[PDB]
Amino acid sequence: MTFITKTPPAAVLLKKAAGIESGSGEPNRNKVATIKRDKVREIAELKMPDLNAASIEAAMRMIEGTARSMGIVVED
């Protein structure tokens, strides 16, 4: 996936894949999808080989905080 196939940014990829299309569209309190680590897990795996992540748990760190930018909650 290194040929004109660059993945999207954590948030986008998160709000996109984990944040579905946009069940909200005009939210307010934020958080429109509560996915388990299984989502930020794969998501990080895809955007892992290309992102500046520093490690699995490291990707979830910046990946999770980024999710809070839209509404991709993450529960253990």
Swiss-Prot record:
GO cellular component: cytosolic large ribosomal subunit; ribonucleoprotein complex
Subunit structure: Part of the ribosomal stalk of the 50S ribosomal subunit. Interacts with L10 and the large rRNA to form the base of the stalk. L10 forms an elongated spine to which 2 L12 dimers bind in a sequential fashion forming a pentameric L10(L12)2(L12)2 complex.
Residues that span the membrane, as ranges: none
Name of the protein: Large ribosomal subunit protein uL11
Gene: rplK
Molecular function, one GO term: large ribosomal subunit rRNA binding
GO terms under biological process: translation
Keywords of this entry: Methylation, Ribonucleoprotein, Ribosomal protein, RNA-binding, rRNA-binding
The family this protein is said to belong to: Belongs to the universal ribosomal protein uL11 family.
UniProt function note: Forms part of the ribosomal stalk which helps the ribosome interact with GTP-bound translation factors.
Species in which this protein is naturally found: Geobacillus stearothermophilus (Bacillus stearothermophilus)
First and last residues shown, out of full length: 59 to 133 of 133
Keyword flag Plastid: no
PTM note: One or more lysine residues are methylated.
Keyword Ribonucleoprotein: yes
